[PDB]
């Protein structure tokens, strides 16, 4: 019953108001038996011995509590630093508005840090309470910030945790970027626009003139930032409508010095009424005082939840922050200070005014965007994909067909070769066939933009334990539409419950089946008759290292003997056993059905066996959380109930001479 | 070349380094940094080139003038009042609690005075400042797990045998660095502790588990395991004929070369040892040296960078278009010299740790009768020279 | 609270340090607002200040852009300025007050301090004691000739006060060409009292800024 307050102040005027609040704060307790100390320190330049002349008027009245009672703190960089280290070996709390920096709220090297300021971390908090509405998960993390960023970073990373979901781009950066414009090209690309700077005010005005010289200033972006953020010199580029959230409690010494003191005086009572009020030792200088009861007086203090007529729940965040502070979100729209929301404690619901943007509208904007960035990759699939080399540089004359009729064709910029051979040497070749017809047909169906690029390895990729920080995925294009290189894969992968595991189908549009290419033991009779099912070491025919046949091959249970027969002879492309089988080098070549069918009909010397096993739709391989995933397919079988994908493919892969 | 005759009328000439926490080691251990200081001003002095352009490292005892273990108020106030005397140019901390370790932080940021923090135990690092370094020179796993990725990679085995006895170790910076390589392969790990009180059944479980990794991964790996399970295995090993072509048992965790196990060891195994120790005097060496590589590369830069002083009063900061504290924390992270007791190398002046010297001694089957460790490689750092 | 009060000693020495105190004590100084002072002489016009922040970004113009150097006192929630070499059209009627950042207008009454040029001796010459006489003679309206006749002290632009807060119906500031000489013959005038007659005794007493005089007559 003797708990005495310490307070921290600067100006005479922030010790009459300190007294104010404490003969005030008789209606708060109820008027109880405990005496609030007038301590009344004068402010000092130098940060230590300030510290040093608090510690010694606390320590001639033994006071129990911290609190600063002045937004200017004494240290030269604005932190509270030194009533940190200086309360943290007495296991003091510090219960005084110092700063609205978030990395000195996170408690990693410090224990005795309470500052009931409201950081980032809070405001990223009010940010995701009010984002449950919005479903704006995918945020782009360009803070340029090495401790605030840091803060931010782990923040989000923790809300995505506690979501049950996941971002779209989280990284940090450094201050002092100048080609900032590389960032917002980078998030104009992803379909995330949540744009979140909360670094300083520098970096706040120059992405906001980086964004004003593209004209991608509200246009759809989402632009949350703080009082802090829009302070100094940040506004004097952005138009009227950023979301400037205002620090309520963060710089007032009015009636926040009074809050704070009532809150204070209410945390103690409720901490004297429960049990754990031993009285620590005398903490004089140049002796160890060292409170051994230092995390049972935190844990009692920490649960001191109040039933106050302004704020209907108080109670601390995970790092030590306000007891639910109500942050009144404003906007700049006219350059005012409108509410568009309170934080109550469980949502933010708004009063009278809404969300306003500068570029977009009044209403829910567009946070996510549309599918119209779809990069076709092909492949070696000359049967289907036509891939002709250029004419001219960029000139692709379109070639005739058997009805007389100059065949749109798309060009196709890729390295021509393998990996060895062209690791980034794009080459555009004038790449015709069904595959272009297809793709015009969607674009004319839909609004999407395709964009037709060549890959730069040759091979599809497999499941195995890749040499990449041992990742169990695809090594090849399945791979790169993973990584977000790839769309759309437009070639016809094989369905299957292993590749249904990381990404998904669409609708099938070649519905063929595999066979064997033979030369016509002269016959094959397909690939259960034992005199190829146990093949010797001379007795192997073509196969393609990571290919359908691998996959088919790998997925067996009873051809695991011939599986590893394979290995021998395997290619990095098609071509090269196509090559070989037609120019009597090897027995046999296990391919698709329509290729082989094709090579048959051209080929006269190679003639392809009739059984034909493995019927099954291969299906267009999609992303996994595509918007458009259903759309696509409901395009293609739209596309094949009609008379028009029957025609061209009799057209185009039917050659029979 | 500017001649710097301007702004040693204070120091004079002398680069003055503070002797703050003078207070012996007495918290969790009786170490002495008197001593350690003694004998690393008598170690500079003896190989002269250390300090040059005429400079010397002002050792200035700041003592308060156990009960001062951890206040800081002494070691801060009365120690900041009697180095302003002439100049803060240089300061050497030796933490002993959270207590002399906090104001570290506080001190690098109203003087701008690049500080080192030789702390005991590993501490968060939640201050990413360059100003307050952090240097603790203590058995650290990175090295071992570097060594045991470069033995894999020059040998093609992707599998291992990971021995998790306790979980009371720095297995994170393992973990972190797994994550990275493609090189590990685990399918079983070897526990010794796992509820087996008595002893039939932990060598049944033992019994189990080396036939299991007989075929799925024959290379156990040392990475986190007592020395007591060390002995067992060494024991049950010679009484079941665990050969290395069979078990191939790798000692990854090298502490000390007087620590390390040299009976029962099986012809063929893979036993590497630190030859530095963890000596304070031969640490307080190493900072006094990487120091000296400091302000000589600041001296090589601007003549009047290292002879500046940051600070002259305890309440002054550099906040100039030219400071020196940003340079000087700054220059010492690209220079990485090779320290006494280890390689210094600084990581990005944070997360500091030195890499101490290794060497491969596989211990194979000696031909004249007497277990010697033949030094079949080298690693002077990442590189290892075959022969 | 709302405090725009300008505290700054509006009388110094020529070609001196001008130590301008704006005692703003209202919500907060933590880089919040501009703080800076509106070069409004009459005859030119003014340029496009500067602002202070946290770091106290002394630099205002290109030309004093580091010659000056504004002293961030964060004891008393204010800051100093270091003002030197200051010309004739610089030195005019400043407004070291709560600047919105943005430069909006104004929603408040005519404040400020307006330092002058003159010597602190030539100004500083002894309050003359004049008794105040009434007239009650000239009895032409509803406004006549009656007042104090103080003069001889601190320039005009200080804290013009009356007989202990007396009637201030029709009070309005209004900077004027300043006197070399340093005898400003300041002298207030109301328009409805002070013009009746009788006795009634309408003595004023101008305060003064670096001083706080009010018991000259």
């Known amino acids: 019953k003797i708990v005495n307050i310490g307070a921290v102040l600067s100006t005479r005027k922030h010790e009459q108001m300190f007294r104010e609040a404490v003969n005030q704060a008789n209606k708060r307790h109820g008027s109880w038996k405990i005496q609030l100390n007038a301590t009344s320190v004068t402010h000092k330049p130098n940060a230590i011995q300030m510290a040093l002349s608090v510690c010694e008027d606390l320590i001639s009245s033994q006071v129990y509590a911290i609190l600063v009672s002045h937004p200017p703190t004494p240290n030269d960089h604005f932190t509270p630093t030194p009533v940190s280290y200086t309360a943290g070996f007495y296991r003091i709390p510090v219960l005084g508005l110092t700063t609205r920096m978030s990395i000195y709220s996170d408690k990693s090297i410090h224990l005795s840090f309470l500052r009931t300021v409201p950081p980032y971390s809070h405001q990223s908090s009010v940010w995701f309470e009010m984002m449950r509405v919005y479903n704006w998960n995918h945020i782009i993390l360009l803070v340029s910030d090495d401790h605030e960023g840091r803060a931010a970073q782990k923040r989000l990373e923790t809300l995505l945790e506690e979501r049950e979901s996941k971002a779209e781009k989280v990284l940090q950066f450094d201050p002092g970027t100048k080609n900032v414009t590389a960032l917002l090209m980078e998030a104009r690309e992803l379909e995330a626009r949540v744009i979140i700077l909360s670094a300083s005010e520098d970096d706040a005005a120059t992405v906001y003139r980086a964004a004003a010289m593209l004209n991608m200033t509200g246009s759809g972006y989402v632009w949350l930032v703080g009082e802090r953020e829009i302070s100094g010199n940040a506004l004097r580029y952005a138009p009227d409508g950023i979301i400037g959230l205002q620090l309520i409690n963060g710089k007032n010494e009015s009636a926040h010095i009074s809050d704070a003191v009532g809150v204070v005086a209410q945390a103690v009572h409720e901490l004297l009424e429960k049990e754990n009020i031993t009285d620590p030792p005398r903490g004089c200088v140049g002796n160890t005082n060292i409170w051994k009861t230092g995390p049972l007086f935190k844990r009692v203090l920490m649960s001191s939840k109040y039933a106050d007529g302004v704020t209907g729940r108080v109670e601390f965040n995970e790092d030590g922050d306000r007891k639910f502070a109500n942050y009144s979100i404003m906007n700049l729209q006219n350059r005012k200070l409108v509410q568009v929301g309170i934080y109550n404690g469980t949502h933010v619901i708004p009063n009278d005014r809404k969300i306003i943007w500068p570029g977009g509208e009044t209403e829910k904007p567009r946070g996510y965007q549309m599918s119209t960035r779809l990069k076709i990759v092909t492949i070696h699939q000359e049967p289907f994909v036509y891939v002709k080399p250029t004419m001219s540089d960029g000139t692709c004359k379109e070639e005739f067909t058997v009805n007389g009729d100059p065949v749109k064709k798309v060009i196709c910029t890729g390295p021509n070769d393998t990996s060895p051979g062209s690791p980034r040497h794009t080459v555009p070749q004038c790449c015709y066939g069904f595959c272009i017809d297809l793709l015009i047909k969607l674009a004319r169906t839909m609004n999407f933009t395709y964009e037709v690029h060549l890959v730069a390895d040759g091979k599809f990729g497999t499941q195995e334990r890749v040499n990449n920080s041992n990742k169990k995925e695809w090594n090849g294009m399945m791979g790169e539409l993973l990584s977000g290189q790839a769309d759309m894969i437009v070639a016809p992968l094989t369905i299957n419950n292993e590749r249904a595991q990381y990404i998904e189908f669409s609708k099938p549009f070649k519905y063929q089946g595999l066979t064997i290419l033979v030369k016509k033991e002269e016959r094959i009779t397909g690939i259960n008759d034992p005199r190829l099912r146990n093949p010797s070491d001379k007795f192997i025919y073509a196969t393609v290292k990571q290919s359908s046949v691998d996959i088919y091959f790998r997925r067996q249970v009873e051809l695991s003997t011939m599986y590893r027969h394979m290995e021998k002879h395997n290619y990095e492309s098609a071509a090269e056993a196509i090559q070989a089988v037609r120019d009597n080098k090897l027995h046999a070549f296990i391919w698709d059905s329509a290729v082989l069918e094709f090579e048959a009909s051209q080929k006269c010397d190679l003639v392809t066996t009739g059984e034909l096993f493995f019927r099954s739709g291969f299906g267009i391989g999609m992303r996994k959380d595509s918007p458009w995933k259903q759309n696509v397919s409901l395009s293609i079988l739209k596309s094949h109930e009609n008379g028009f994908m029957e025609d061209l493919d009799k057209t185009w892969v039917r050659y029979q001479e | 070349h500017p001649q710097p005759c301007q702004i040693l009328k204070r120091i004079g000439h002398a680069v003055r380094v503070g002797a703050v926490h003078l207070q012996p080691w007495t918290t969790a251990e009786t170490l002495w940094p008197r001593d350690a200081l003694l004998f690393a001003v008598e170690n500079l002095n003896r190989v002269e080139g250390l300090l040059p352009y005429n400079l010397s490292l002002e050792v200035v005892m700041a003592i308060e003038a156990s009960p001062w273990s951890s206040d800081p108020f002494s070691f801060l106030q009365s120690v900041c009042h009697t180095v302003v005397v002439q100049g803060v140019s240089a300061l050497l901390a030796f933490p002993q609690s959270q207590g002399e370790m906090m104001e570290l932080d506080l001190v690098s940021s109203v003087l701008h005075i690049p500080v080192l923090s030789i702390v005991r135990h590993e501490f968060p690092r939640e201050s990413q400042n360059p100003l307050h370094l952090q240097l603790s020179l203590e058995n650290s796993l990175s090295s071992d797990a570097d060594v045991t990725v470069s033995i894999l990679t020059m040998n093609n085995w992707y599998n291992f045998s990971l021995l998790l006895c306790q979980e009371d170790w720095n297995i994170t910076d393992f973990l972190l660095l797994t994550e990275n390589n493609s090189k590990f392969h685990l399918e079983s790990v070897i526990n010794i502790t796992a509820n087996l009180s008595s002893t039939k059944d932990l060598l049944s479980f033992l019994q189990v588990q080396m036939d299991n990794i007989r075929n799925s991964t024959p290379t156990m790996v040392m990475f986190g395991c007592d020395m007591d399970s060390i002995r067992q295995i060494f024991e049950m090993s010679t009484q079941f004929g665990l050969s290395p072509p069979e078990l191939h048992w790798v000692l990854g965790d090298s502490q000390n070369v007087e620590e390390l196990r040299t009976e029962g060891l099986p012809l063929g195994l893979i036993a590497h040892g630190k030859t530095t120790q963890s000596v304070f005097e031969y640490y307080v060496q190493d900072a006094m040296e990487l120091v000296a590589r400091a302000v000589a590369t600041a001296t090589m830069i601007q003549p009047e960078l290292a002879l500046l002083p940051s600070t002259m009063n305890c309440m002054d900061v550099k906040t100039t278009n030219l400071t020196s504290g940003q340079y000087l924390s700054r220059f010492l992270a690209n220079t990485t010299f090779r320290g006494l007791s280890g390689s210094i190398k600084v990581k990005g002046s944070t997360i500091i740790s030195s890499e101490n010297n290794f060497f491969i001694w596989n211990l194979q089957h000696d031909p004249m009768g007497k277990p010697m460790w033949t030094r079949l490689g080298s690693w002077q750092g990442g590189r290892i020279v075959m022969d | 609270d709302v405090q725009l009060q300008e505290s700054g000693p509006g009388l110094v020495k020529p070609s001196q340090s001008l130590s301008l105190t704006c005692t703003v004590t209202?919500?907060?100084?933590?880089?919040?607002?501009?703080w800076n002072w509106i070069r409004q002489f009459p005859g030119n016009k003014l340029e496009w200040m500067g602002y202070?922040?946290?770091?106290?970004?002394?630099g205002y113009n290109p030309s004093l852009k580091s010659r000056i150097s504004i002293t961030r006192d964060t004891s008393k929630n204010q800051f100093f300025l270091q003002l030197n070499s200051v010309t004739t059209e610089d030195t005019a009627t400043y407004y070291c007050?709560?600047?919105?950042?943005?430069?909006?207008?104004?929603?408040?009454w005519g404040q400020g301090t307006s330092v002058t040029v003159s010597s602190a001796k030539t100004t500083t010459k002894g309050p003359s004691v004049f008794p105040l006489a009434p007239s009650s003679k000239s009895t032409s309206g509803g406004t006549a000739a009656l007042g104090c006749l103080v003069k001889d002290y601190f320039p005009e632009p200080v804290t013009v006060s009356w007989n202990s807060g007396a009637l201030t119906s029709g009070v309005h500031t209004f900077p004027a060409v300043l006197q070399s000489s340093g005898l400003y013959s300041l002298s207030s005038v109301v328009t409805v009292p002070s013009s009746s007659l009788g006795t009634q005794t309408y003595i004023c007493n101008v305060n003064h800024k670096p001083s706080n005089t009010k018991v000259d007559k």
């Open positions: 209202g919500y907060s100084i933590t880089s919040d607002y501009a």
């Open positions: 007050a709560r600047l919105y950042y943005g430069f909006y207008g104004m929603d408040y």
């Open positions: 202070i922040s946290y770091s106290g970004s002394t």
